Structure 1
Amino acid sequence: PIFLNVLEAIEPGVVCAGHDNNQPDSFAALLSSLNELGERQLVHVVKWAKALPGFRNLHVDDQMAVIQYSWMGLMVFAMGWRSFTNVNSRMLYFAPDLVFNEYRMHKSRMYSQCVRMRHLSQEFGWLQITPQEFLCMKALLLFSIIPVDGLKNQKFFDELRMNYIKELDRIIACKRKNPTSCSRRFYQLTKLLDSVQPIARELHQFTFDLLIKSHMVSVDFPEMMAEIISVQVPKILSGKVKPIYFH
């Protein structure tokens, strides 16, 4: 289980937001914690991505671009699984110190996005996603969004993405002698992966608008995040960078 040992080995641990839960909920505070949390998780997404099998093959510039484009989606996917395993989808488990109930979802002004993630959370349970399918799907998620004008080394990217899809096939086939059974499972999983993109898009859109009016809502955007929202996020929203759907 070489490939799976590695994913299990590099999976990031618990990341906290540093939120003040003794303080009454407020839009400004909730968003500042989401921003800080986002930034803390990105530190780990980079380290995780760099230790992924084959990731170093990519051109240095494609490595940073791919990580930044996939950032939101990766957090969404990982948060849904935590929400499912920790609180059986009753609340969104952004972090141990940042759990959203409907009241928080509503005050964050990202209710529709939150409800969609809760649904994703429920999907992990309904589809009985195993920890291993989760780890592979998550890694594959990192290789699911590219520029129309291509990466510096598109070919190396295509090879890598193909190899990860082949790993998922193996995880699905393992203990499934029935081809039909493997096909239906692959269908279910690629469908779940595709559902992540639309959610990341709404969060992207929301975050973009929020930054532009940041000075009007007292929200504190971290340096790195502000730069990525203004430089990378617009390419996605304008259609220059697109996610790779299966369906």
Structure 2
Amino acid sequence: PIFLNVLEAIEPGVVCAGHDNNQPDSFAALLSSLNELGERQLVHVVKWAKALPGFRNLHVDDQMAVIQYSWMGLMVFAMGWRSFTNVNSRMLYFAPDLVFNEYRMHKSRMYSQCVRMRHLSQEFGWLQITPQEFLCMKALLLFSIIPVDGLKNQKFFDELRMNYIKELDRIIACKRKNPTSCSRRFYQLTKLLDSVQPIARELHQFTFDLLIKSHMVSVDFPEMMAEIISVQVPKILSGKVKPIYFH
């Protein structure tokens, strides 16, 4: 299981937000912690992504762009899985020091998005997603959103994406003799992966509007995140950069 060995080997560890939980909840504090946590996780998504089999095959410029576009969705998918395994979807497990109950979901002003992520979290359970399916689906997620005008080396991207789909096939075929069984499973998983995109979009829209009025709500936007929200996120929102849906 060479491929799976690698994914398990590079899977990021626990990342904390640095949030002050002895402090009464406030929109400003929660969001500053969400921004900090997001920036902390990106550091790991970068090290993780660059260690992915075949990732270096991509053109330099395409590697960064792909990470930046997939950033939100990758965090959403992993957060849902954490919420499922840690608290059985009872709450959103952004980080051990940043757990959201409905009250926090409401005070964050991202309640609708959070409810969609709790549902995602429940999906991991209902579909009985295995730890290995999760790891392959996550890696696959990284290669599921590109520019309409294409990447610098679109062909190397296509091959890579195809190879990751094949890996998912293999993990599904493993311990499944009936193709019909493999087919339904592939159907379920690709359906789950697609569902992540609309979620990231709402978060993208939400974060973008917040940045634009950040000086009003007293939100301190990290330098790196600010740049990406103003340079990359608008491409996704304006339709220049779109996710690849299966269905």
Structure 1 residue 72 displacement after superposition: 0.1
Residue by residue over 1:191-217, the C-alpha shift from the partner in whole angstroms, topping out at 9 and shown as x without a partner, is 000000000000000000000000000
Provide the C-alpha distance between the structure 2 equivalents of 1:119 and 1:192, rounded to a whole number of angstroms: 11
User: Share of identical aligned residues, percent?
Assistant: 100
Structure 1 residue 24 displacement after superposition: 0.1
Provide the C-alpha distance between the structure 2 equivalents of 1:42 and 1:70, rounded to a whole number of angstroms: 10
Q: With the length of structure 1 as denominator, give the TM-score of the two structures.
A: 1.00
1:96-107 to 2 correspondences below 5 Å = 96-107=96-107
Correspondence for 2:127: 127
Structure 1 residue 154 displacement after superposition: 0.1
Residue by residue over 1:103-149, the C-alpha shift from the partner in whole angstroms, topping out at 9 and shown as x without a partner, is 00000000000000000000000000000000000000000000000
Residue by residue over 1:14-71, the C-alpha shift from the partner in whole angstroms, topping out at 9 and shown as x without a partner, is 0000000000000000000000000000000000000000000000000000000000
SS of the residue corresponding to residue 207 of structure 2 reads: helix
Structure 1 residue 2 displacement after superposition: 0.0
Structure 1 residue 96 displacement after superposition: 0.2
SS of the residue corresponding to residue 20 of structure 1 reads: coil
Residue by residue over 1:156-182, the C-alpha shift from the partner in whole angstroms, topping out at 9 and shown as x without a partner, is 000000000000000000000000000
Provide the C-alpha distance between the structure 1 equivalents of 2:219 and 2:177, rounded to a whole number of angstroms: 53
Provide the C-alpha distance between the structure 2 equivalents of 1:120 and 1:232, rounded to a whole number of angstroms: 25
SS of the residue corresponding to residue 165 of structure 2 reads: helix
Structure 1 residue 98 displacement after superposition: 0.1
Provide the C-alpha distance between the structure 1 equivalents of 2:200 and 2:21, rounded to a whole number of angstroms: 26
Provide the C-alpha distance between the structure 1 equivalents of 2:185 and 2:170, rounded to a whole number of angstroms: 12
Aligned-residue CA RMSD (Å) = 0.1
Provide the C-alpha distance between the structure 2 equivalents of 1:76 and 1:180, rounded to a whole number of angstroms: 30
Provide the C-alpha distance between the structure 2 equivalents of 1:43 and 1:140, rounded to a whole number of angstroms: 19
Correspondence for 2:156: 156
Name structure 1 gaps, 5 residues minimum.
none
Provide the C-alpha distance between the structure 1 equivalents of 2:171 and 2:72, rounded to a whole number of angstroms: 25
SS of the residue corresponding to residue 82 of structure 2 reads: helix
Aligned length: 247
SS of the residue corresponding to residue 35 of structure 2 reads: helix
4+ residue segments displaced more than 6 Å: none
SS of the residue corresponding to residue 196 of structure 1 reads: helix
Name structure 2 gaps, 5 residues minimum.
none
Structure 1 residue 8 displacement after superposition: 0.2
SS of the residue corresponding to residue 228 of structure 2 reads: helix
